Amino acid sequence: MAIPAFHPGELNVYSAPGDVADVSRALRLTGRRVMLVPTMGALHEGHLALVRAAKRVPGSVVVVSIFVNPMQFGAGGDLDAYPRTPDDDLAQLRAEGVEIAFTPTTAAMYPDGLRTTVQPGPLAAELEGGPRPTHFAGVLTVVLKLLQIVRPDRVFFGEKDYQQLVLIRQLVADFNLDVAVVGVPTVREADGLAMSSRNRYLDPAQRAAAVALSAALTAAAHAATAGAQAALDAARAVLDAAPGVAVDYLELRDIGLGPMPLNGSGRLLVAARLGTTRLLDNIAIEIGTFAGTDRPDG
Amino acid sequence: MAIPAFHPGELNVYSAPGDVADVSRALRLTGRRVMLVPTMGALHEGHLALVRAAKRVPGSVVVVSIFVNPMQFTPDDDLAQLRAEGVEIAFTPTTAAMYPDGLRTTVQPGPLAAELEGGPRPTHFAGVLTVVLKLLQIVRPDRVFFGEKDYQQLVLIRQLVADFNLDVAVVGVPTVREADGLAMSSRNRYLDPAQRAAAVALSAALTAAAHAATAGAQAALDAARAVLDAAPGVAVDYLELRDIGLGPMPLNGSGRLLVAARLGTTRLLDNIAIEIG
Ligand SMILES: COc1ccc2c(c1)cc(C(=O)OCc1cc3ccccc3o1)n2CC(=O)O
Ligand SMILES: COc1ccc2c(c1)cc(C(=O)OCc1cc3ccccc3o1)n2CC(=O)O
């Protein structure tokens, strides 16, 4: 009762929040499980893995949102006119059998400018948040809004942007949101580079050196049998051997981004600049007496 | 795993957020409309009026949450009143249940929160909006009911709902008043009989202003000031005429006149609808 056109088995594209909210609600009433994949477009194989994870849930209908949230741009930073490929985007979604694309305007998302917003916890001031102190407020505000509009049963995020994922789990816990946050392992290029829409920014020399991030992390994960100092120093030596790579941070944390014990299990996160382009990556890691395995570590 | 225990036409009291969310989901699916009445307990005729408004919605089940929110500003007596009112659900969470991770992700209100009541208390409304978002997420009501007495708060809640695209109706219920017109409040018990007699000046100023308003905005404001000037011991923090969303009052039209004042140590608030000329 009030439903926009909806063609099942087809990609249906809605800009109006109200429209996708009424479609999502009707679909929920028929007992389909609504899955949300929030994106900023320029879709790559990583996003497709998110869509495929969502597709695997029985009864799933998949909503992919595409919205370049200005409240996570720019000055300073981040300073890029973000890649926009709306045509290819929807043709990828079609091929994958996604039924809903939500592509709102800025005016429909922010009809009152920045008025009520989400204040993230103090994790948002660390790491990615240090130099850009309101960035995560912008992520968590738009993600809360997407969740209220679409009301999915689960929402799917890549693990690459690991701080953002943790903060979104924080959001969902803290506001009692009735949604499951699904983190999906990072899709990588063949040489190990974490997929990102911003990888296309890299010139040839830079694309070649950028392999050092994933090579560092992988080297660290295997060095870690010998402890956290070995893991870190192995990662930093790889990073230092790559020309044109400038390290922002290289840090060990627990899975929730608290302190890492030595001899435990956690995450190693890295951010670096190549010319003007910032890259992130992270890996699961186990250190010391926690890194023993049947065979060779780890 | 079973839907938790719900006994229709009795008062069902849940302390676990999970419990209430489950029960409310179940009923929304068995064809009830879920109504939420958020309270801090110490219930009075004012809250019962919120209760009665909710009850009247056909097919309603009424959820009355009772939570004293540390981030903001008598158990078995409250539950008595609700049972007597035919309230089917009371939600009575603990602080640890509401805040297991302490103060982490919170709501940041827009600039309205730094004004009027937010001048004395600049983080009051952040706590209010945060708990209200949480209660709305836990109960998912069709409609949420608030008194108009805390009008700035009501307006902020409507900002929350619009801004976070919450799909709930916010229902403001006209302020219940004592026979002399004093807006009902918990704080009215504080008042010695002199403060209590002097307290009538707030509602009297506002209704005099409402009626003076046929002669314009200055007439309305001057009438309210005269009435307040006639009261001893009433320290007026503000008296402001605004539009109904608490922006600038238009030239003429519909607005809201708001007052706050201190009597000894009790801070009292009131507001009224005003139609200019
Ligand atoms: C699982 O394999 C991968 C590997 C890398 C991945 C993904 C999947 C997905 C992304 C991604 O960013 O999506 C865009 C986005 C949506 C969004 C919504 C709210 C806030 C921030 C947001 O950022 N990326 C990184 C990238 O494209 O640079
Ligand atoms: C329309 O008739 C009236 C008249 C006066 C009224 C009410 C109704 C309601 C209240 C009231 O405060 O309820 C408690 C409350 C709970 C809560 C939870 C989260 C946020 C804010 C919140 O405020 N009062 C004033 C009072 O009793 O202090």
XYZ file of C-alpha atoms and ligand atoms in Angstrom:
631
model
C 0.000 0.000 0.000
C 1.750 3.087 -1.555
C 4.499 1.188 -3.418
C 6.527 2.735 -6.316
C 6.918 0.589 -9.448
C 8.967 -2.518 -8.465
C 9.993 -5.090 -11.081
C 11.190 -8.335 -9.362
C 14.241 -9.892 -10.920
C 15.063 -6.470 -12.391
C 17.316 -3.677 -11.066
C 15.008 -0.986 -9.692
C 16.666 2.438 -9.172
C 15.197 4.879 -6.615
C 16.479 8.307 -5.629
C 13.694 9.155 -3.182
C 14.346 7.972 0.344
C 10.568 7.538 0.751
C 10.375 5.273 -2.239
C 13.087 2.859 -1.182
C 11.693 2.972 2.395
C 8.203 1.884 1.144
C 9.628 -0.745 -1.210
C 11.920 -2.122 1.536
C 8.922 -2.287 3.909
C 6.678 -4.129 1.426
C 9.508 -6.575 0.690
C 9.966 -7.156 4.464
C 6.225 -7.899 4.870
C 6.488 -10.722 2.283
C 9.187 -12.190 4.534
C 12.178 -11.401 2.340
C 15.374 -10.457 4.265
C 16.602 -7.039 3.146
C 20.365 -6.770 2.787
C 22.191 -3.449 2.510
C 25.506 -2.771 0.791
C 26.333 0.970 1.355
C 28.723 2.298 -1.236
C 29.995 5.463 -2.790
C 29.872 3.943 -6.299
C 32.812 3.247 -8.608
C 32.153 -0.392 -7.940
C 34.849 -3.040 -8.111
C 35.201 -6.712 -7.297
C 35.282 -5.906 -3.560
C 31.779 -4.414 -3.717
C 30.670 -7.454 -5.777
C 31.970 -9.764 -3.040
C 29.762 -7.697 -0.637
C 26.795 -8.132 -2.972
C 27.546 -11.885 -3.302
C 27.736 -12.288 0.468
C 24.338 -10.543 0.721
C 22.947 -12.658 -2.149
C 23.850 -15.928 -0.333
C 21.292 -15.303 2.463
C 18.050 -17.230 1.642
C 15.135 -14.863 1.027
C 17.565 -11.980 0.493
C 16.668 -8.934 -1.508
C 19.723 -6.776 -2.046
C 19.785 -2.932 -1.771
C 23.000 -1.243 -2.883
C 23.131 2.417 -2.012
C 25.341 4.785 -3.967
C 25.897 8.193 -2.419
C 29.101 10.216 -2.334
C 28.540 11.721 1.036
C 29.759 15.289 0.951
C 29.962 15.246 4.801
C 33.027 12.997 4.390
C 34.691 15.555 1.943
C 36.845 17.593 1.535
C 39.087 20.386 2.960
C 41.119 18.927 4.339
C 40.728 16.063 3.698
C 39.837 14.215 1.768
C 40.502 16.254 -1.332
C 39.562 14.100 -4.360
C 36.711 14.371 -6.769
C 35.828 10.735 -6.005
C 35.497 8.432 -9.019
C 31.978 8.428 -10.439
C 30.934 5.730 -12.948
C 27.118 5.523 -12.379
C 26.457 3.652 -15.705
C 28.990 0.881 -15.244
C 27.925 0.760 -11.595
C 24.328 -0.138 -12.417
C 25.409 -2.500 -15.216
C 27.553 -4.366 -12.627
C 24.597 -4.484 -10.257
C 22.324 -5.800 -13.045
C 24.757 -8.577 -13.916
C 24.821 -9.603 -10.275
C 21.078 -9.757 -9.999
C 20.711 -6.918 -7.454
C 17.079 -5.717 -7.432
C 17.390 -2.300 -5.640
C 19.766 0.612 -6.280
C 19.295 3.643 -3.996
C 20.965 6.766 -5.451
C 19.724 9.772 -3.346
C 20.501 13.464 -3.963
C 22.321 15.502 -1.401
C 19.201 17.632 -0.941
C 17.079 14.593 -0.001
C 19.741 13.378 2.526
C 20.507 16.804 3.971
C 17.305 18.920 3.520
C 18.324 20.709 6.801
C 22.086 20.828 6.381
C 23.971 19.418 9.332
C 21.516 19.639 12.132
C 21.063 16.443 14.177
C 24.268 14.362 13.735
C 25.945 11.298 15.283
C 28.786 11.943 17.716
C 31.156 8.904 17.429
C 33.061 7.572 20.450
C 36.734 8.508 20.978
C 38.039 5.772 18.602
C 37.023 8.289 15.861
C 39.788 10.675 16.949
C 42.511 8.074 16.403
C 44.320 6.762 13.299
C 42.234 7.853 10.336
C 40.579 10.424 12.620
C 43.737 12.187 13.930
C 44.162 14.684 11.040
C 40.418 14.687 10.071
C 38.476 14.840 13.391
C 34.863 15.055 12.037
C 35.265 12.421 9.224
C 33.759 9.531 11.137
C 30.907 11.698 12.312
C 30.037 12.043 8.673
C 30.355 8.315 7.989
C 28.229 7.354 11.032
C 25.585 9.986 10.308
C 25.030 8.876 6.731
C 25.224 5.157 7.675
C 22.584 5.611 10.495
C 20.388 7.410 7.937
C 20.807 4.672 5.259
C 19.898 2.081 7.953
C 16.728 3.923 8.961
C 15.600 4.439 5.392
C 16.253 0.881 4.211
C 15.876 -1.024 7.573
C 17.927 -4.074 6.493
C 18.361 -7.256 8.476
C 22.106 -7.190 7.744
C 24.521 -4.614 6.394
C 27.726 -5.468 4.605
C 31.084 -3.709 4.773
C 34.584 -4.502 3.611
C 37.257 -5.181 6.254
C 39.802 -2.927 4.440
C 38.512 0.206 6.143
C 38.818 -1.520 9.453
C 38.454 1.488 11.786
C 35.234 2.505 10.013
C 33.828 -1.057 10.454
C 34.567 -1.090 14.155
C 32.926 2.371 14.553
C 29.851 1.115 12.669
C 29.634 -1.895 15.034
C 29.916 0.704 17.815
C 26.980 2.704 16.261
C 24.749 -0.371 15.884
C 25.474 -1.574 19.472
C 25.182 1.843 21.078
C 21.898 2.915 19.369
C 20.355 -0.589 19.696
C 19.968 -0.905 15.979
C 18.268 -4.154 15.058
C 20.769 -5.025 12.191
C 23.709 -7.439 11.875
C 26.909 -5.867 10.664
C 28.715 -8.285 8.342
C 32.444 -7.611 7.736
C 33.709 -9.333 4.582
C 37.445 -10.103 4.020
C 39.196 -7.677 1.684
C 39.263 -8.525 -2.010
C 42.776 -8.030 -3.446
C 44.477 -7.636 -6.813
C 46.725 -10.527 -7.934
C 49.881 -9.034 -6.392
C 47.985 -8.543 -3.080
C 46.963 -4.881 -3.266
C 43.691 -4.294 -1.438
C 41.004 -3.229 -3.859
C 39.897 0.380 -3.681
C 38.151 2.765 -6.082
C 41.128 5.103 -5.420
C 43.738 2.635 -6.763
C 43.134 4.077 -10.273
C 44.758 7.289 -9.015
C 48.168 5.556 -8.801
C 50.648 6.219 -11.655
C 52.706 3.179 -12.927
C 55.676 3.580 -10.543
C 53.169 4.112 -7.667
C 51.013 1.091 -8.545
C 54.179 -1.078 -8.466
C 55.424 0.271 -5.067
C 51.838 0.106 -3.614
C 52.232 -3.744 -3.424
C 54.518 -2.957 -0.360
C 51.519 -2.446 1.876
C 50.123 -5.947 1.549
C 53.685 -7.391 1.322
C 54.544 -5.667 4.686
C 51.418 -6.914 6.379
C 51.900 -10.461 5.106
C 55.616 -10.401 6.071
C 54.556 -9.181 9.593
C 51.936 -11.914 9.958
C 54.681 -14.564 9.397
C 57.369 -12.803 11.377
C 54.976 -12.630 14.382
C 55.993 -16.082 15.637
C 59.053 -14.211 16.814
C 56.983 -11.494 18.559
C 55.383 -8.019 17.984
C 58.688 -6.251 17.626
C 59.781 -8.640 14.830
C 56.349 -8.380 13.130
C 56.423 -4.548 13.188
C 60.051 -4.243 12.122
C 59.554 -6.738 9.297
C 56.545 -4.671 8.047
C 58.489 -1.355 8.359
C 61.558 -2.812 6.478
C 59.281 -3.791 3.520
C 57.634 -0.328 3.538
C 61.112 1.335 3.710
C 62.351 -0.739 0.679
C 59.526 0.638 -1.543
C 60.383 3.877 -3.267
C 57.895 6.714 -2.884
C 55.927 5.127 -0.033
C 55.445 7.442 2.962
C 54.176 5.763 6.080
C 51.357 7.448 7.992
C 51.120 4.663 10.612
C 51.767 1.031 11.178
C 49.952 -0.206 14.273
C 49.011 -3.314 16.220
C 45.609 -3.305 17.952
C 43.089 -5.715 19.392
C 40.058 -6.648 17.207
C 38.059 -3.739 18.675
C 41.083 -1.396 18.207
C 42.073 -1.305 21.863
C 45.631 -2.175 23.061
C 47.169 -5.344 21.629
C 48.519 -7.778 24.291
C 51.795 -9.137 23.401
C 51.266 -12.773 22.527
C 47.711 -12.381 21.437
C 45.539 -12.046 18.373
C 44.685 -8.726 16.841
C 44.972 -6.650 13.767
C 47.874 -4.916 12.056
C 46.784 -1.731 10.291
C 48.780 0.421 7.892
C 48.224 3.722 6.064
C 50.677 5.310 3.713
C 50.891 8.034 1.037
C 52.135 7.487 -2.529
C 52.627 10.907 -4.083
C 49.221 12.418 -3.218
C 47.249 9.154 -2.793
C 46.501 7.590 0.601
C 46.168 3.832 0.900
C 44.944 1.712 3.797
C 45.199 -2.017 4.470
C 45.055 -4.300 7.547
C 45.433 -7.946 8.400
C 44.403 -10.405 11.101
C 47.483 -11.257 13.015
C 48.595 -13.536 15.843
C 51.768 -12.860 17.862
C 54.218 -15.128 19.744
C 52.758 -18.069 21.760
C 49.477 -17.326 19.960
C 51.030 -17.816 16.444
C 51.874 -21.567 16.763
C 50.022 -23.755 14.206
C 50.022 -27.433 13.076
C 52.824 -27.154 10.491
C 54.832 -23.855 10.180
C 53.746 -20.485 11.704
C 51.419 -18.874 10.856
C 13.745 -19.717 20.930
C 10.250 -18.528 21.991
C 8.811 -14.984 21.752
C 8.943 -13.806 25.429
C 5.899 -14.126 27.705
C 3.089 -11.630 26.959
C -0.314 -11.687 28.847
C -2.872 -9.499 26.843
C -4.968 -7.145 29.001
C -2.538 -7.496 31.890
C 0.465 -5.256 32.671
C 3.600 -7.028 31.347
C 6.843 -5.643 32.877
C 10.123 -6.229 30.967
C 13.551 -5.090 32.145
C 15.629 -6.535 29.289
C 15.652 -4.420 26.097
C 15.773 -7.672 24.093
C 12.576 -8.847 25.773
C 10.606 -5.715 24.889
C 11.902 -5.550 21.334
C 10.800 -9.194 20.797
C 7.312 -8.739 22.337
C 6.750 -5.505 20.325
C 7.869 -7.123 17.053
C 5.423 -10.013 17.748
C 2.406 -7.686 18.333
C 3.148 -5.403 15.369
C 2.880 -8.676 13.355
C -0.312 -9.834 15.172
C -2.015 -6.586 14.092
C -1.459 -4.111 16.965
C -0.154 -0.582 16.633
C 2.678 -0.089 19.198
C 2.495 3.259 21.144
C 5.467 4.470 23.237
C 5.254 6.769 26.261
C 8.718 7.609 27.530
C 8.824 8.634 31.212
C 11.199 8.999 34.113
C 8.625 7.515 36.568
C 7.222 9.561 39.447
C 4.075 9.360 37.278
C 1.305 12.042 37.516
C -1.885 13.127 35.797
C 0.295 14.567 33.062
C 1.812 11.192 32.135
C -1.641 9.597 32.424
C -2.784 11.983 29.800
C 0.043 10.710 27.496
C -1.163 7.173 28.331
C -4.785 8.013 27.475
C -3.878 9.575 24.127
C -1.932 6.417 23.141
C -4.718 4.047 24.354
C -7.272 5.749 22.097
C -5.453 4.770 18.852
C -7.555 1.711 17.721
C -5.603 -1.584 18.000
C -2.990 0.079 20.199
C -0.761 -1.666 22.630
C 0.817 0.879 24.961
C 4.446 0.763 26.065
C 5.448 2.972 28.978
C 9.142 3.079 29.457
C 10.463 4.095 32.888
C 14.116 5.092 32.937
C 15.995 7.730 34.842
C 18.559 8.772 32.284
C 21.939 9.690 33.945
C 22.860 11.608 30.697
C 19.738 13.901 31.185
C 18.048 15.579 34.244
C 8.988 5.237 43.374
C 8.672 1.977 41.267
C 5.553 0.037 42.439
C 3.349 3.144 42.700
C 3.984 3.923 39.005
C 3.133 0.386 37.927
C -0.118 0.584 39.944
C -1.221 3.649 37.918
C -0.401 1.859 34.624
C -2.294 -1.333 35.581
C -5.239 0.972 36.544
C -4.820 2.721 33.149
C -4.919 -0.617 31.289
C -1.320 -0.306 30.158
C -0.154 -3.612 28.685
C 3.631 -2.990 28.666
C 6.009 -1.253 31.045
C 9.687 -1.229 30.044
C 11.921 -0.678 33.008
C 15.610 -1.097 31.989
C 18.621 -0.673 34.263
C 21.378 1.841 33.548
C 23.862 -0.875 32.686
C 21.350 -2.375 30.273
C 20.920 1.028 28.541
C 24.605 1.975 28.752
C 26.707 -1.248 28.735
C 29.586 0.640 27.081
C 29.157 3.861 28.997
C 29.098 7.060 26.951
C 30.336 6.034 23.525
C 28.345 6.834 20.325
C 25.916 9.707 21.139
C 23.489 12.024 19.403
C 24.759 15.544 18.656
C 21.583 17.884 18.520
C 21.453 20.738 16.091
C 22.011 24.465 17.199
C 18.553 24.726 18.818
C 20.089 22.665 21.709
C 22.516 25.527 22.661
C 19.592 27.892 23.327
C 16.909 28.484 25.926
C 17.174 25.396 28.150
C 20.598 24.591 26.629
C 22.068 27.869 27.949
C 22.136 26.634 31.589
C 22.654 22.974 30.450
C 24.630 22.553 27.183
C 24.689 18.661 27.049
C 21.174 18.091 28.497
C 19.522 17.591 25.097
C 22.304 15.321 23.783
C 21.451 12.936 26.618
C 17.734 13.336 25.937
C 18.085 12.662 22.172
C 20.431 9.774 22.702
C 18.039 7.919 25.148
C 15.068 8.677 23.006
C 16.787 7.291 19.854
C 17.686 4.226 21.844
C 14.098 3.740 23.139
C 12.726 4.197 19.635
C 15.139 1.589 18.363
C 14.329 -0.879 21.183
C 10.515 -0.563 21.020
C 10.023 0.585 17.374
C 6.724 2.271 18.067
C 4.295 3.488 15.470
C 3.819 6.687 17.563
C 5.762 8.232 20.418
C 3.990 10.591 22.896
C 5.463 13.653 24.712
C 3.961 16.534 26.739
C 4.152 20.039 25.181
C 5.403 21.440 28.498
C 8.950 20.703 27.529
C 8.432 22.275 24.175
C 12.100 22.759 23.137
C 12.634 19.081 23.917
C 9.590 18.086 21.799
C 10.895 20.238 18.926
C 14.343 18.629 19.228
C 12.756 15.150 19.141
C 10.958 16.083 15.910
C 14.372 17.207 14.582
C 15.853 13.849 15.618
C 13.117 11.892 13.864
C 13.272 13.954 10.667
C 17.078 14.093 10.617
C 17.638 10.377 11.269
C 14.756 9.380 8.940
C 13.048 7.563 11.835
C 9.709 6.193 10.835
C 7.767 7.075 13.932
C 5.050 9.688 14.529
C 5.887 12.143 17.264
C 2.703 13.143 19.137
C 2.763 16.187 21.331
C 0.070 16.210 24.052
C -1.174 19.600 25.387
C 0.115 20.338 28.921
C -2.042 19.108 31.833
C -2.507 21.867 34.410
C -3.448 22.231 38.078
C -6.822 24.019 38.699
C -5.081 27.415 38.930
C -3.201 26.729 35.620
C 0.278 25.762 36.908
C 1.810 23.228 34.435
C 2.043 19.849 36.104
C 5.474 18.814 37.078
C 7.392 16.653 39.540
C 8.986 19.812 40.839
C 5.655 21.326 42.044
C 6.027 19.325 45.324
C 9.233 21.226 46.120
C 7.294 24.534 46.411
C 6.457 26.050 49.806
C 3.001 27.640 49.753
C 4.437 31.107 48.894
C 6.452 29.817 45.929
C 3.470 27.752 44.914
C 1.191 30.827 44.895
C 3.840 32.909 43.101
C 4.318 30.036 40.529
C 0.868 30.722 39.040
C 2.405 33.905 37.384
C 4.053 31.800 34.674
C 0.861 30.289 33.272
C -1.013 33.540 33.993
C 1.595 35.594 32.042
C 1.385 33.114 29.103
C -2.424 32.948 28.806
C -2.721 36.714 29.275
C -0.208 37.003 26.395
C -2.184 34.458 24.285
C -5.300 36.745 24.623
C -3.506 40.110 24.412
C -2.117 38.801 21.010
C -5.144 40.023 19.060
C -3.433 43.429 19.613
C -0.074 42.252 18.260
C 3.241 40.812 19.399
C 4.397 43.699 21.561
C 0.967 43.748 23.361
C 1.368 39.947 24.000
C 4.920 40.306 25.351
C 4.131 43.416 27.480
C 1.093 41.639 29.012
C 3.258 38.623 29.962
C 5.999 40.891 31.441
C 3.411 42.863 33.541
C 2.066 39.667 34.990
C 5.589 38.430 35.897
C 6.501 41.866 37.264
C 3.597 41.398 39.695
C 5.055 38.228 41.211
C 7.521 38.199 44.152
C 10.403 35.687 44.225
C 10.151 34.769 40.475
C 13.495 35.107 38.698
C 12.746 34.918 34.973
C 15.542 33.370 32.948
C 13.883 34.100 29.613
C 10.588 34.991 28.028
C 10.745 34.409 24.304
C 8.284 34.480 21.443
C 9.294 32.202 18.528
C 7.729 30.418 15.534
C 6.326 26.937 16.126
C 9.707 25.232 15.314
C 11.428 27.771 17.557
C 13.008 29.884 14.800
C 12.368 33.699 14.639
C 8.762 34.710 15.225
C 7.277 35.670 11.819
C 5.779 39.203 11.349
C 2.442 37.560 12.360
C 0.997 34.045 12.380
C 1.380 31.048 14.638
C 3.997 30.932 17.323
C 5.047 29.733 20.685
C 5.712 31.861 23.779
C 8.104 30.205 26.232
C 9.091 31.137 29.778
C 11.452 29.704 32.418
C 11.998 31.018 35.937
C 13.590 30.185 39.285
C 11.554 30.106 42.537
C 13.992 29.512 45.411
C 15.801 26.482 44.003
C 13.058 25.168 41.680
C 13.400 25.992 37.979
C 9.935 26.064 36.326
C 9.082 26.072 32.592
C 5.931 26.777 30.613
C 4.945 27.729 27.067
C 1.787 28.355 25.187
C 0.480 28.617 21.624
C 0.218 32.190 20.380
C -1.446 33.509 17.234
C -0.221 36.976 16.327
C -3.010 39.493 15.621
C 35.656 -6.846 0.530
O 36.434 -6.311 -0.513
C 36.476 -4.955 -0.471
C 37.717 -4.318 -0.530
C 37.751 -2.921 -0.507
C 36.558 -2.181 -0.415
C 35.318 -2.815 -0.360
C 35.285 -4.205 -0.390
C 34.358 -1.868 -0.280
C 34.968 -0.682 -0.283
C 34.224 0.704 -0.199
O 34.811 1.695 0.232
O 32.919 0.891 -0.601
C 32.637 2.240 -0.676
C 32.108 2.884 0.602
C 30.847 2.797 0.976
C 30.688 3.419 2.132
C 29.560 3.622 2.911
C 29.676 4.316 4.096
C 30.916 4.813 4.481
C 32.045 4.631 3.691
C 31.931 3.907 2.511
O 32.832 3.554 1.539
N 36.298 -0.883 -0.383
C 37.393 0.127 -0.414
C 37.371 1.117 -1.609
O 36.554 0.961 -2.548
O 38.232 2.028 -1.536
C 1.101 16.922 28.795
O 0.990 16.712 30.224
C 2.217 16.642 30.800
C 2.597 17.642 31.708
C 3.867 17.592 32.308
C 4.773 16.553 32.031
C 4.377 15.558 31.117
C 3.105 15.595 30.510
C 5.401 14.697 31.019
C 6.401 15.109 31.809
C 7.755 14.330 31.936
O 8.815 14.925 32.223
O 7.776 12.966 31.707
C 9.016 12.436 31.911
C 10.128 12.359 30.824
C 10.648 11.193 30.466
C 11.581 11.369 29.527
C 12.398 10.444 28.861
C 13.318 10.891 27.932
C 13.398 12.255 27.690
C 12.611 13.182 28.364
C 11.671 12.741 29.286
O 10.756 13.378 30.112
N 6.025 16.244 32.459
C 6.859 17.054 33.436
C 7.454 16.311 34.680
O 6.774 15.464 35.223
O 8.576 16.617 35.109
